[PDB]
Amino acid sequence: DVNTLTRFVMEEGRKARGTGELTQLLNSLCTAVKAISSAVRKAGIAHLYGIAGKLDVLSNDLVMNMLKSSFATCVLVSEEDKHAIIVEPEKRGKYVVCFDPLDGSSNIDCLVSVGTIFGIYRKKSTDEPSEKDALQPGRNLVAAGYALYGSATMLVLAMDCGVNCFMLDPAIGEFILVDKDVKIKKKGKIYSLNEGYAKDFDPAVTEYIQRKKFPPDNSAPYGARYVGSMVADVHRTLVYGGIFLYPANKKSPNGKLRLLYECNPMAYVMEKAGGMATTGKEAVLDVIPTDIHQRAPVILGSPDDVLEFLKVYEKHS
Amino acid sequence: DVNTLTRFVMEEGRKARGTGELTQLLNSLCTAVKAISSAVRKAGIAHLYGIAGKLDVLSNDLVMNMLKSSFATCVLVSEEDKHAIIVEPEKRGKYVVCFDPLDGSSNIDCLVSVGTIFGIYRKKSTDEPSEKDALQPGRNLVAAGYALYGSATMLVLAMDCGVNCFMLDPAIGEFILVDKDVKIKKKGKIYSLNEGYAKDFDPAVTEYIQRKKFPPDNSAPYGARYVGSMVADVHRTLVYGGIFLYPANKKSPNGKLRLLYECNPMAYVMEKAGGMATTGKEAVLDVIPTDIHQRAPVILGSPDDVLEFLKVYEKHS
Amino acid sequence: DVNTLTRFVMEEGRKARGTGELTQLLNSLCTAVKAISSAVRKAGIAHLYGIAGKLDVLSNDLVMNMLKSSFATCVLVSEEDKHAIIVEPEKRGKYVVCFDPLDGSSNIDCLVSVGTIFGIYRKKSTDEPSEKDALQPGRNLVAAGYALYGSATMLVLAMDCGVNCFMLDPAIGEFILVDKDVKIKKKGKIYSLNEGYAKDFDPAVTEYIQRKKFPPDNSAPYGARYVGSMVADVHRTLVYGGIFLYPANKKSPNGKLRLLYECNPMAYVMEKAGGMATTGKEAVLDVIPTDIHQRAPVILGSPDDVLEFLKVYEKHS
Amino acid sequence: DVNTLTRFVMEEGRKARGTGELTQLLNSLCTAVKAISSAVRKAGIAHLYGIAGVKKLDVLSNDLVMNMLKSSFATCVLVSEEDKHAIIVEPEKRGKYVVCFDPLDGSSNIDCLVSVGTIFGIYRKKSTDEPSEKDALQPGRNLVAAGYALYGSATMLVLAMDCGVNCFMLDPAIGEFILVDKDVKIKKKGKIYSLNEGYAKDFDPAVTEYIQRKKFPPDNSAPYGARYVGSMVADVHRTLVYGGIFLYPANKKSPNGKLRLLYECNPMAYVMEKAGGMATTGKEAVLDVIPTDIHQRAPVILGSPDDVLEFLKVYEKHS
C-alpha cells in the first residue's frame, strides 16, 4: 500500500485517539515546507529578472503564518525572531514549536543544501503563554525532525515509536514514505567536524580524531565528511553511520549550535534511531535550558563511536 | 533585459557566424540537463510507490540519446561506459564530448549534491573516429562546464570569452542568466580535501595542510569543507574562493579522480574564471591522456591558494 | 487567513468530530485529483516520445487505488467499470463513492475541458457490501463536486452548508480556497445546449429557445455558449448564470447523461448554491436509481430560468 | 527521433540559410507562451491569497509578449489588441519584422475557466520608409508565419508556415514544446457548425437559411452538431482537429463583422489554408482584404472547404 505523510499522521492519531490538534499542526508544517522548497528551487525567478519588463525571511514568514492559522500553537520560537512569538487568543492552541526556518541559509550562495528543523513540545502549565513554555528539556519532546532540501526534498520525522523518512514528489506535492523505522549502524567509518579549527580543539577531541586516522592496531582509518550545513551532515550520519561533532572548546565552552531548534531535534532523532547524542558531560536530551537562544555542544552518531569518544573525553577529565 | 541560455548561445553563434552545429549541441545538452534535474528532484516518484496500484544509468541514457540525436557528435566518453562510444554514420557531426552523467551518485542515498560534468572537443584527427579522438589534452576544449543539482539547479557554462551561470526556473523551464562574466576570488579562506587519508599523505600535502590549521603568520585559520561530491566542492570554491585537493594515497597511487570527464572540465572552468588547476608536476589541462578512464591528482581553486601549494611542493623536490 | 482544502476538511471534520474516516477519504480523493491533473497537463510527455530512448484508464486506476487504500470505502461505481467494485475485507470502511474519473475525455484531442465528478454516500445496511449500496437517490449525498481541468484546475466541493471553490496551485500541490459559499444568479442571460439536435426537440424546448432568441416582450435576447464537456458547461452556469439543458426527447426518453456520477453530483451542487435542477417531470435529486449506469435528462442553472422553462413545459401538458 | 520546437525551428532556419532573426523571434515568443501558460494555470496563487501573510492576466500577457519581442532584436512594428496605436520599436532594438497579435484572446470569460489563447501573425517590413503604423496595413497574403497557443486541458503551440502546420505539446516538467502532430490537414467536410445563435434576430437572410439547412437538412441526412465555446482559439482549433465550420458573420447592425482583421481574422485564416481549409468574408477572401485601419473589423467564415462552400452558395442566392 502507498503511504503519504498525511495518511501516516492521521493513522497514528486515530491509534492514539487524540482530538486532531497535533495533526492540524503537522499538516500546516508540511504545507509550509512545500512552499519553502518551491522558493528554494527558484520557481518564478525569471520574473525578478525582467520577463515582463529574502529567502529565509520568506521561509520564516511561511512557517509563522501557517502555524498561527493552524489554531494549534501558542508559543513560537524561531531562529529569525529575537523574542518568542505569542499567538493571539483567537488563534491559540496547545502546542509549542521551536524551529530554524532555513538552516544553512548563510552559505546559500554556493547552492549548498539547506533545511528546516523543528521541535514540537506540549504546553505544561495553564498560565498565560510566554517564553517559559519553550524552556523544556529535550526529553519532553512530542515529535521532532527536519526537512532536507537536498538533491531532493525529504522530511525525516521522529516520534516515540521511531524515525520515518518521507520523500517530496514535486509533480503532486506529496511526501512519500520511503524508509520505515531506521536505525543507525552500531559503529561507523566516517567522522564529521571542521578540522580547520585544529589549533582550538579540546585535548580529548585532538586525540580522538588522531585515533580515527592512525589506529594503534591494524584497522582501516576512517574517511572524513563536512558539508557545513547541519541538516545535511546529520542526515548522512543517520544513513551511513559514523560520528558528528560540533564540540566544546575553551573559546566556546558551550559550543556554537543552538540547543532548542538545532541540538534537541537532532539528538531526539538520533536516540530514536538507536544512536547517542552527548555534550561530553551529559546527554543533550537531559539539558534544561534557561534561554531560548542558548547554545549546546553536541557529539552524536553511532553508539560504539560516541562511547569511544566518551572514553577519550573522560581520560582527559 | 532578460536573457536566457538559448538566447545567449544564439547571440554568440551569430557573432561568430558559424553554422549552428554547436548551438544544436548546446541546446540538446541543456535539454538533457533539465530532464535529469527533474529526475534527481524525484518528480513522479509517487508512482514507483504504488499511487496508481537506476538514476545515474538513466542520467547516462538521457545524455547519450540527446547528444546522438543532435547530429553534432562522433565520439562520446562517459563514466558509466567501459569503452568510448562511436556515433553511427547517419548521426555524426564534428564534436567530441566527455561527460560524467551523475557525479556523486554514490552518496545519492544521503541526498548529497549531485551534478553533470561535461567537456566539449572539436574532432581533431581526420581518421575514422575512435577512442583516440577523446585523448586530447584539456587545452583543446571548445567549451566546458557542469550542472549542479543542489538546493536549486544551476548550469555553469565556460568558453573562450569567460564563464556564465544560468539558474533553472522550473516554473517555465528556462535557464535565466544571473551571473555574467564570473571571476573567482584571488585568494580564499576555505580548504577542501578528505583528511582520512592523512596516514598516506605525501610530505608536501602534510606540510600544506599544517599551514592551513596553524598559520605561520598568525593569520586566521582556514575553514574546511568536504562534501564528498566534486561538483558541489568545486562550485563552492568557484563561488567563494579557496582550494580543493584530491591527491594520491596508497589505495590510489595515480590519484583518484578521472582526467577526461572530471579533472579537465573543472580545470577549464577554473582557468576561464581566473583560477588554477595542477597535479603537482604540471597543469591538469596540459596532461596528455593515454587511457580514457585514467586518474590524475588535482589541486585547484583561487590562484593565490594553488601557488602556495606548489611552492610547498617544490620544497620537497 | 489562507485556507486550503485539507485545512477546510479537517476543521469541518473536527466540528462534527466524526471518526476521521470521511477525512481519510477526501484526502485520498484530493490526492488522486492532483495526480490526474499532472498527467492531463502532459507532465513527462517527453519520456513517452523517446527523450531517453490511456489517460482515462490511468485516471480510473488512481482514483480506484487511492480510495481502496484509504480504508474508508466498500462500494465504488465508476464510469470506467461495468460492475461496481467491492473493497477487500481488510480495507473495508463505511462510505460509498460514485465517480467519473475523466469526464469528456473523448474530446480531449481538441484539448477541450475535462473533469472529475464524484458523489459520496454512506453504507445503507450492515450486511456484506454489494452494488445496492450505490443505488441511492441524490437527496442522500453527504458531499459531491468536481475538478475542472480547464485553463486552471479548480475543485468545487458541495456539502450541507453550501458550496466552496478551490484552486490548485501547481507550484506547491495545494488546493487554495478562492470562493466561499457561492450562489448562482436568480436569472441569467445565456442558454447552453446542442442546437444541432433542433429536429428532435420536444415542443416545449423548441418554444423556450424561441423566446430566448425572439423575446415577445422585446427584452434583449440571450447569448449562446456550448463547450461540449459537461463539467465545463455546468461550471460556466454557476459562475455567470443562465441555464444548461440536456433534455429528454422522443429518441432518448431518459436523456444522455448518467444519473449516479454526472447528473446527481451536479444537481446537488446547483441546489446547494441556490439553483435548481430538473428532469422536466421532477427534481434530479428525487430520482431513485435502479441501475448504476442509468441515464436522466437535466435542465439546471439560475432559478428564474428553470421556472420559466417549466412554465413553458407545463403549458405543453 | 524526439523533436522539440526549438530543434524544429533551428532545423528549418538552417535549411533556408537565413540570418537567424526569425528563429530568435519565435524562440522569444515560445518563452512568452510558457510564462503566460504558467500564469494562466495559477502557479503561485497561494501568495495572492495570504499563505505568507496583482496585474490582470491580459495586461501581464500583453506585457510578456511585448517585452520578449522587443528584446529579440527581430521586430519593428507591433500591433496588439490591447493598444490603440501601433508600437514602433526603439532604434537600438529594431529588426525587420512586424507582428500583429492578440495576447490573451477570450480572457473576458476567463472567470469560467474557459479555454484562452494567444494569436499571432508575422510580416516582413515591406517599405523602406521610417517604420510607422502603415507598415501593418498589409493583407493576409503577406504573412511569413502565423499560429496560436491554446491554454486548454494542456498547453499546445500550433505553428503554420509556407510548408504546412505543426503542433507542439508543452511538457511542463522540463519546459519544452514536443512535436506531436506533424503536417496537419483539416477534413474536407465536417459535422459541427460554430456560431452564436442567441443573436438570431439580427441574422442576415442567408445565415438564417444556412443554419436552417444544418439543423433541418433538405436531403434528410443526419444534422450537424453545434459547438460554441465563445473563445476563438478554442473553437478554431476544434475545427482544425475535427473539421466543420466556424462563423462570425456580418449583419445589418454590424455590416463589417465583429472580429478584428489584423490579429484575429488573418492568423486564423492563414493556419486554415496552410492545412487545406478556407476562410472568407462572404464578399471576398479574408487574406485579400487591404486594411485602412489597424483595428478595423471583418466578418469571417472558416473551416472545412466543403462546409464553407455550402455557405457561399446560400450567400449568393441572396445576392
Ligand SMILES: Cn1nc(Cl)c(Cl)c1Oc1ccc(S(=O)(=O)NC(=O)Nc2ncc(Br)s2)cc1
Ligand atoms: C505523537 N506523535 N508525534 C508524531 Cl510525529 C505523530 Cl504522527 C504522533 O502521533 C500522534 C498522536 C496524536 C495525534 S492527535 O492528537 O492530533 N490525534 C488526532 O489527530 N486524531 C485524529 N482523529 C481523526 C483524524 Br483524521 S486524526 C496525532 C499524531
Ligand SMILES: Cn1nc(Cl)c(Cl)c1Oc1ccc(S(=O)(=O)NC(=O)Nc2ncc(Br)s2)cc1
Ligand atoms: C564557442 N562557444 N562556446 C559556447 Cl558555450 C558558446 Cl555559447 C559559444 O559560441 C558559439 C560559437 C559558435 C556557434 S555555431 O558554430 O553553432 N554557430 C551558430 O550557432 N550560428 C547561428 N546562426 C544562426 C543562429 Br540563431 S545561431 C555557437 C555558439
Ligand SMILES: Cn1nc(Cl)c(Cl)c1Oc1ccc(S(=O)(=O)NC(=O)Nc2ncc(Br)s2)cc1
Ligand atoms: C460531511 N462533510 N462533507 C464535506 Cl465535503 C465536509 Cl468538509 C464534511 O464535514 C465532515 C464531517 C465529518 C467528518 S469525519 O467524520 O471524518 N470526522 C473527522 O474527520 N474528525 C476529525 N477528527 C480529527 C481530525 Br484532524 S478530523 C469529515 C468531514
Ligand SMILES: Cn1nc(Cl)c(Cl)c1Oc1ccc(S(=O)(=O)NC(=O)Nc2ncc(Br)s2)cc1
Ligand atoms: C519561414 N519560417 N516560418 C516558420 Cl514558422 C519557420 Cl520554422 C520558418 O523557417 C525559417 C526560415 C528562416 C529562418 S532565419 O532567417 O531565422 N534563419 C536561421 O535561423 N538560420 C539558422 N542558422 C543557424 C541556426 Br542553429 S538557425 C527561421 C525560420
